[PDB]
């Protein structure tokens, strides 16, 4: 399959991937696409495990680039399961015939810059070589599973899974002693679905997470049907905001209110379910006196969801500030902890000393399990270009650049490695938006600079070092005017021993973001240098 020469060449096909595609194609330019994964999707490919769900509303998260697919799709649920998207991204792949600029199961291992022809050269690991122009690493934020770090692992005789890289067949935990390991959003999702088969069910929780009623609801077929009629003008109002969603900025600080309208206020937004939540003051991811009066009344909805104390008490997240690791939206995960047969195991108390052959030794005992699920999470931001021996010039490796966190301009690009851009990652908005928005906006800015720089004749594009310095500084002190480095979070690189601990996003909002990236695009890429 992949073509030996091509203008751009793509990594990934997922909905960044698969966008590119589609925009090159239509700006004429010869693009092709290498993915792992046999077929499309990226994380809805992957993540088959019971329970996986979006937690940003069908309706938001979706492609806005299509009238047509605006149009005829009909999403069925306020929040879309990952079967159901996965059959989204196979109705796009099939309008836009996409597959015929793709090689699936193929994974890039290396690349490297050549200065004398202003070209990437490409390896993958069934020994294809392809020379690109560009190269646009659209291969995720959240691609590269994390197994725990305990000894004893390769001795489990039960079945071993991650959510991350689930089997593709359903796997049935009928009458078993299952272990899930993890309690991010992966672990609240998948764990209900195993208690209502497993014997018994014991979650190993570290830190407890906030989580927060998603109240899924069926979508009204009416409601829909109005949506479509004005479904591009609906999708700028989201453009135009800090979360790429319709949620409300309340005005208001957390700190002015009386306590009496505080409860009255979050009490709606419990009801209500999701996310919004987050947005009801204009501090509470600035201030820690806002954010514990919100958090301590999520804390207190939590010890009146789980009736017997202690393991309520257990559940209520403490040591952080709400927010600041991502928000989760839960389904009968609280009301599961009822169940007779579900046990918590608090290893913040009783921590994990090893995986054995049969289960799981804590300090205080062992548990026997015929199947153990991580929900550990991912390697998140750079895991995936770190798999990659990526080389610019004067053979600098990513890897040791960004050695100490990512370093970029506007995300984008890094300075010493020309004509290579990262889609939705570090030093950009990227997981803080909804992601549609955060990949449709730099789907759309990096091929059209690729088409500037076709129409110009110029073939070499690179972020200016002092540019990008300037940018990683601003990132950085934007962040710490905001509570998001206080946590350890896969944000800051938390999730992988020895990773540096950096806040490695864009906090100032999409919609800044975006001014900010067409500013630089309309004065003809200022803090790059084109020849
Ligand atoms: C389970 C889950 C649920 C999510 N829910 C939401 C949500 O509700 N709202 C939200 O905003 N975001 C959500 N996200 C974030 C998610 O990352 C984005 O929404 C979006 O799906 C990412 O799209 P992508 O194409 O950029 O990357 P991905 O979907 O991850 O696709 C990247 C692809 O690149 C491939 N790849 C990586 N390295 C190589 C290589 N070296 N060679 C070849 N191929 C490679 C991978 O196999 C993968 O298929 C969720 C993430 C996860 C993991
Ligand atoms: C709904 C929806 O849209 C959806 C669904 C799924 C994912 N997503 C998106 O992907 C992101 C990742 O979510 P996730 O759940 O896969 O991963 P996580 O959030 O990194 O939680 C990891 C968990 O494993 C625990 N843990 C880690 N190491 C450990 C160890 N050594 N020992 C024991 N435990 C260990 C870790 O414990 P602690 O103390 O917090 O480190 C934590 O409990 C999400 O944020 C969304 O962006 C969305």
Known sequence: QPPEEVDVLVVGAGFSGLYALYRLRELGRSVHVIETAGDVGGVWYWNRYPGARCDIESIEYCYSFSEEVLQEWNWTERYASQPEILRYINFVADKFDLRSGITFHTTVTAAAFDEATNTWTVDTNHGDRIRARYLIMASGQLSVPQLPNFPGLKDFAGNLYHTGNWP?????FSGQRVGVIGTGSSGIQVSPQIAKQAAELFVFQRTPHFAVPARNAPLDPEFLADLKKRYAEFREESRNTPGGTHRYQGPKSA??????????????????????????????????????????????????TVR?????????????????????????????????????????SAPIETITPRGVRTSEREYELDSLVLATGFDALTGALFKIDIRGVGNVALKEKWAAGPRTYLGLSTAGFPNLFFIAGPGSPSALSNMLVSIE???????????????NGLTRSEAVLEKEDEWVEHVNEIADETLYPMTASWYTGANVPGKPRVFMLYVGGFHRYRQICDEVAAKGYEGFVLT
């Open 168 to 172: 593709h067949e359903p796997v049935d």
């Open 255 to 304: 700190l002015e209110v009386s306590d009496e309208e505080l409860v009255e206020t979050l009490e709606r937004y419990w009801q209500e379910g999701g996310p919004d939540i987050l947005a009801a003051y204009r501090d509470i991811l600035r201030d820690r006196d806002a954010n514990e009066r919100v958090a301590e009344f999520i804390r207190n909805k939590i010890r009146n």
């Open 308 to 348: 017997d104390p202690e393991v309520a008490e257990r559940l209520v997240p403490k040591g952080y500030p709400f927010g600041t690791k991502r928000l989760i939206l839960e389904i009968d995960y609280y009301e599961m902890f009822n169940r007779d047969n579900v046990h918590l195991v608090d290893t913040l």
């Open 441 to 455: 906006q730099h789907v759309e800015w990096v091929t059209d600079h690729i088409a500037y720089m076709f129409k």
